[PDB]
Design a protein around this ligand. Structure first.
Ligand SMILES: *[C@@H]1O[C@H](CO)[C@@H](O[C@@H]2O[C@H](CO)[C@@H](O[C@@H]3O[C@H](CO)[C@@H](O)[C@H](O)[C@@H]3O)[C@H](O)[C@H]2NC(C)=O)[C@H](O)[C@H]1NC(C)=O
Ligand SMILES: *Sc1ccc([N+](=O)[O-])c(C(=O)O)c1
Ligand SMILES: *Sc1ccc([N+](=O)[O-])c(C(=O)O)c1
Length: 297
């Protein structure tokens, strides 16, 4: 048993029927010795008396808000959450595996520039009685609260998307990163305690916003057209240091590529086709932005 936060404790259990469990001794945080009584959750049943209470924690029934009373008053609480360890590996019932980069990815982090600011997201089937706590650091990072940012429909069930925004306290955009950023997330659903983590350098999780103000300018006595665009607003300043490279593609009806560092390109439009442009950090091979498109008709 260990303290997660003030008056909240986690008990690590090997998860299988009739597991021995853990002998847990709760001590009431009161200096009074007389008339102490003990209760679990909403039940009125006295489990014992005295300053100490011993329980065998073997299942969720033994977990909960243990309360010590004196003269009808509440003296202290000891909230017991469990951390199930099924077949040698900690449970992951709360968050869905996003499966995107390479399996067992529950936390997905992304940055839009080098400001030291980033966003992490996760998905759950659970709609309430669910709390999250996010902490982050390099190897001084401040994170806001995990907020509900999207609600979707996946088959029979519902999918809730949570996101958190963090900022490195004393960022330095242009500097080389020697130590990666670490995100730690605690997940509590009723009485189930879970643990999640992610390690990355800002440079690797970068994905700029798409090129903006895409324009198509036809040319006289030419089959070709000129497409032009601008750097996105959220991208890092100045562009001279933090430059972007681009890729142009003509997306037609068929489903069976030009690279440039410029904000313009000359291409051939065709009926029913669209011109598409993506961006990548010129100097680091991170994620390509989402497409910005302009149609040919
Ligand atoms: C994510 O979950 C894991 C596993 O439940 C957490 O690891 C556990 O962390 C606690 C807190 O530091 C460790 O407890 C300490 O154990 C020593 C004796 O071994 C004791 O002297 C300390 O007072 C305290 O009780 C616990 O051993 C450790 N479990 C394992 C198997 O390593 C981990 O901390 C969680 N991540 C978080 C909340 O950041
Ligand atoms: S890029 C950068 C900004 C601020 C500071 N700072 O003096 O705290 C540094 C730095 O000197 O570490 C770098
Ligand atoms: S023009 C272009 C650049 C990058 C990528 N990409 O996302 O790997 C594509 C593409 O394959 O869609 C096209």
């Amino acid at each position: 048993i260990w303290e997660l936060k003030k008056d909240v404790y986690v008990v690590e259990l090997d998860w299988y029927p009739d597991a021995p469990g853990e002998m847990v001794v709760l001590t009431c945080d009161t200096p009074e010795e007389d008339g102490i009584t003990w209760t679990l959750d909403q039940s009125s049943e006295v489990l014992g008396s005295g300053k100490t209470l011993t329980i065998q924690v073997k299942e969720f029934g033994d977990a909960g808000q243990y309360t010590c009373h004196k003269g009808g008053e509440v003296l202290s609480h000891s909230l017991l959450l469990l951390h199930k360890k099924e077949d040698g590996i900690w449970s992951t019932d709360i968050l869905k595996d996003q499966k995107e980069p390479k399996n067992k990815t529950f936390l997905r982090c992304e940055a839009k520039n080098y400001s030291g600011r980033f966003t992490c997201w996760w998905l759950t089937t659970i709609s309430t009685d669910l709390t999250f706590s996010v902490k982050s650091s390099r190897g001084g990072v401040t994170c806001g609260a995990a907020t509900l940012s999207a609600e979707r429909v996946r088959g029979d069930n519902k999918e809730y998307e949570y996101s958190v925004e963090c900022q490195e306290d004393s960022a330095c955009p242009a500097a080389e990163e020697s130590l990666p950023i670490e995100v730690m997330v605690d997940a509590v659903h009723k009485l189930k305690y879970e643990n999640y983590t992610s390690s990355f350098f800002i440079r690797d999780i970068i994905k700029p916003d798409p090129p903006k103000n895409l324009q198509l300018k036809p040319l006289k006595n030419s089959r070709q057209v000129e497409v032009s665009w601008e750097y996105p607003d959220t991208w890092s300043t100045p562009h001279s240091y933090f430059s972007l490279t681009f890729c142009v593609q003509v997306q037609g009806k068929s489903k069976r590529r030009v690279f440039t560092d410029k904000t313009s390109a000359t291409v051939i439009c065709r009926k029913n086709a669209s011109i598409s442009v993506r961006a990548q950090d010129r100097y680091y091979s991170s994620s390509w932005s989402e497409w910005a498109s302009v149609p040919c008709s």
